[PDB]
Design a protein around this ligand. Structure first.
Ligand SMILES: *[C@@H]1O[C@H](CO)[C@@H](O)[C@H](O)[C@H]1NC(C)=O
Ligand SMILES: *[C@@H]1O[C@H](CO)[C@@H](O)[C@H](O)[C@H]1NC(C)=O
Ligand SMILES: *[C@@H]1O[C@H](CO)[C@@H](O)[C@H](O)[C@H]1NC(C)=O
Ligand SMILES: *[C@@H]1O[C@H](CO)[C@@H](O)[C@H](O)[C@H]1NC(C)=O
Ligand SMILES: *[C@@H]1O[C@H](CO)[C@@H](O)[C@H](O)[C@H]1NC(C)=O
Lengths: 117, 117, 117, 117, 117
């Protein structure tokens, strides 16, 4: 009399857990007394872009970020007055597997009691 | 008398869990006393783009971000006055598997008691 | 009489845990008394970009960051007045496996009691 | 009478744990008395970029950082007045396995009691 | 009568634990009395970049640092007035295994009681 128990427990459980929290805080302003005189505020911003012949990546790749190609990126660059950014630019790119990833899981338990009596 | 038990437990449970929270906070303003004089505010912004011959990626790739090609990006760049951004730009790109991912899961338990009595 | 127990416990559980928190703090302002006179504020910013023939990566790679290609990046560069950034630029790119990653898990327990009596 | 127990416990559990916290502190301002006179503020900033023939990486690599290619990067470079950055630029790139990583885990317990009586 | 117990405990658990904390401190300002006069503030900044023929890395490598290619990098370089950076630039790149890393874990316990009675 016998027992053959093969509780093969094949588990693949890849995954991230995250507690993300922003508190803009407390901005307490009491009796703010102000006298502001700014006549003739005249900013000038000239942006000029010219491209004779650009070209992109011809190969095979998988990387997830802006870097991939030739660009002009401007963000909050020249705020002139009273510009507040609270938890403003949160870029969370959680990638488990990038491009060109191959998963082959093989569980093949074998049980062959060849008993002769 | 025998028992053959093969509770092969093949589990693939990939997935992200996230607690995302924004609190704009408390902006308490009491008796804000103001006298603002800004006559003749005259900003000038010139954006010019010219492209003789651009071209995109001819290869095979999978990366999920704006970077993939040649662009001009402007965002909140020149706010002139009283510009508030609270949890404004949250870009959350949670990718488990990118492009070109292949999954082949094979569970083939085998049980062959060849008993002779 | 015998027992054959092979609780082969094949576990692959790759994943990050993170407690991320921002507190903008306390900015307590009492009786802020101000007299500001800034007539004729006139900034000038000239950005010029020209490209005769750029080209991208022809190889196979997987690295996730802006660095990948020839770019002009401007961010919050020239704030002129009263510019506040609280937890503003949080870039969290948690990558378990990059591009071109291959996983092959093989669990093949074998049990063969060849008993002769 | 015998027992054959092979609790082969094959575990691969690679992963980082992080407690990340920012406290902007306390900026307590009482009776801040000010008289500011700044007539004729006139900054000038000239940025010029020209590229005859740049080229990208033709090899195979996986390194995640801005360094990867020839670029012009400007960030918070010339703030002119009252510019506050609190926990502003947090770049956390937690990579367990980079590009071109291969995992082959093989658990193959073998149990063969050949008993003759 | 015998027992054969091989609790082969094959564990691979590589991972970092980190407690990262920022406290911006206390900036206590009482009766700050000021009289600021700065007429005619006129900074000039000229940035010029020209490249006849640059080229990138053709080999195979996995190194995560900005150093990887020929660039011009500017960061907070010339703040003119009242520029505060509190825990501003935190770059944490925690890499367990870089590019081109190969793991082959093999647990193959063998149990063969060849008993003759
Ligand atoms: C963090 O997540 C855990 C669950 O793993 C939860 O018990 C805890 O309260 C969370 N805290 C926050 C601040 O989200
Ligand atoms: C975080 O998620 C967990 C579930 O895992 C929950 O119990 C907890 O209360 C959540 N907290 C917040 C603040 O979202
Ligand atoms: C950190 O995460 C753990 C769960 O592992 C939770 O018990 C703890 O309270 C969290 N703390 C914060 C501040 O998020
Ligand atoms: C750190 O994380 C641990 C869980 O590992 C938790 O008990 C502890 O309270 C956390 N502390 C902070 C400040 O997040
Ligand atoms: C550090 O992390 C440990 C867990 O290993 C936790 O008990 C402790 O309170 C943490 N301290 C801080 C300041 O995060």
């Amino acid at each position: 009399s016998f027992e053959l128990t093969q509780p093969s427990s094949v588990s693949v459980s890849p995954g991230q857990t995250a507690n993300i929290t922003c508190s803009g805080g407390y901005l307490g302003e009491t009796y703010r007394s102000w006298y502001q005189q700014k006549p003739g505020q005249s900013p000038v911003l000239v942006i000029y872009q010219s491209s004779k012949r650009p070209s992109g990546i011809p190969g095979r790749f998988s990387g997830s970020n802006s870097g991939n190609t030739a660009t002009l990126t401007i963000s909050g660059t020249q705020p002139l007055d009273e510009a507040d950014y609270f938890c403003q630019a949160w870029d969370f790119t959680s990638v488990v597997f990038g491009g060109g990833t191959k998963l082959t899981v093989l569980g093949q338990p074998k049980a062959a009691p060849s008993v002769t009596l």
